């Protein structure tokens, strides 16, 4: 029952198969356009007459 | 300062020089001065009202002699001088706010009608703060906005 449950199957003297890890890809400069929105809003609060 | 004068006959004072069929050249739109009224003015001559006529060929030419082309609009100055400039402004803002603390906390109970009379000397807090706010913000947000424009326009 535990040999057929999920990944990491076991039975022949060692438990092998179905490894699980991560790669972590990133760019991190994607919200730059979003940053533009933020900084323009700042000037927005600085420039409409109270 | 500009003026145009028209010589009137010095022999005819009893009659009217201009009938003024309307109210264009009068106390309307201009007033006679004092020094012109001393050396002559409405005596021996008179003044006339100047307006400027602008043709479209020069009209749409005169309003554009201050701008630059696209290298000026998209140019980050430098980051070393920008960091040093911000460091200097924050450094003087430290002592300026330290003076502002004593300026607020003193506030001698006697009505600004004389607190503006002891302010006429060399005293300067509450007045240089917001100028430093302006020169910090309008030089930082413009540079950050231009940095974003440069980093995602060209790619």
- Mark out chain A residues that contact chain B at CB-CB < 8 A: 29, 32-33, 35-36, 39-40, 42-43, 46
Strand stretches in chain A, DSSP E = none
Q: What distance in Å separates the CA atoms of residue B120 and residue B97, rounded to the nearest whole number? A: 20
- Closest partner residue to A39 (CB to CB) among B145, B151, B152 is B145
- Residues B94 and B85: their CA atoms lie apart, in Å, by 14
Nearest chain B Cα to A41, which residue? B141
Question: How far, in Å, CA of B104 to CA of B99, rounded?
Answer: 9
- SS3 assignment, position A16: strand
The experimental technique used to determine this model is cryo-EM
**Domain range for residue B140?**
74-148
Longest dimension (CA), chain B: 83
Query: What phi and psi values does residue B4 have, to the nearest 5 degrees?
Result: -125, 135
Q: Map residue A34 onto helix, strand or coil.
A: helix
Q: Which residue has the tokens 């911000």?
A: B86
Alpha-carbon distance B77 to B71, whole Å?
11
The rounded distance, in Å, linking the Cα atoms of B138 and B145 is: 11
* Greatest distance between any 2 Cα atoms in chain A: 77
What Å resolution does this PDB entry report?
3.5
Q: Which residues does residue B45 pair with via DSSP β-bridges, in sequence order?
A: B7
Query: Which residues of chain B neighbour A36 with C-beta distances below 8 Å?
Result: 145, 148-149
HEC-encoded secondary structure of chain B = CCCEEEECCCCCCCCCCCCCCCCCCCCCCCCCCCCHHHHCCCCCEEEECCCCCCCHHHHHHHCCCCCCCHHHHCCCCCHHHHHHHHHHHHHHHHHHHHHHHHHHHHCCCCCHHHHCCCCCCCCCCCCCHHHHHHHHHHHHHHHHHHHHHHHHHCC
């Amino acid at each position: 029952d535990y040999a057929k449950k999920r990944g990491w199957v076991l039975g022949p003297n060692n438990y092998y198969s179905f490894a699980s890890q991560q790669q972590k890809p990133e760019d991190t400069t994607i919200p730059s356009t979003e940053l533009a929105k933020q900084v323009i809003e700042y000037a927005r609060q600085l420039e409409m007459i109270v | 300062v500009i003026d145009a004068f028209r010589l009137i006959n010095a022999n005819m004072m009893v009659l009217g020089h201009e009938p003024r069929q309307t109210t264009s050249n009068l106390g309307h739109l201009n007033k006679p001065s004092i020094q012109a009224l001393i050396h002559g003015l409405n005596r021996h001559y008179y003044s006339i009202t100047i307006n400027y006529r602008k043709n479209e060929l020069e009209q749409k030419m005169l309003l554009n002699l201050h701008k630059k082309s696209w290298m000026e609009g998209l140019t980050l100055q430098d980051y070393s001088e920008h960091c040093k400039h911000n460091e200097s402004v924050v450094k003087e803002m430290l002592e300026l706010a330290k003076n502002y603390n004593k300026a607020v906390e003193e506030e001698d109970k006697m009505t600004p009608e004389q607190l503006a009379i002891k302010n006429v000397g060399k005293q300067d807090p509450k007045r240089h703060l917001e100028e430093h706010v302006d020169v910090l913000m309008t030089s930082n947000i413009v540079q950050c906005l231009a940095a974003m424009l440069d980093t995602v326009v060209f790619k």
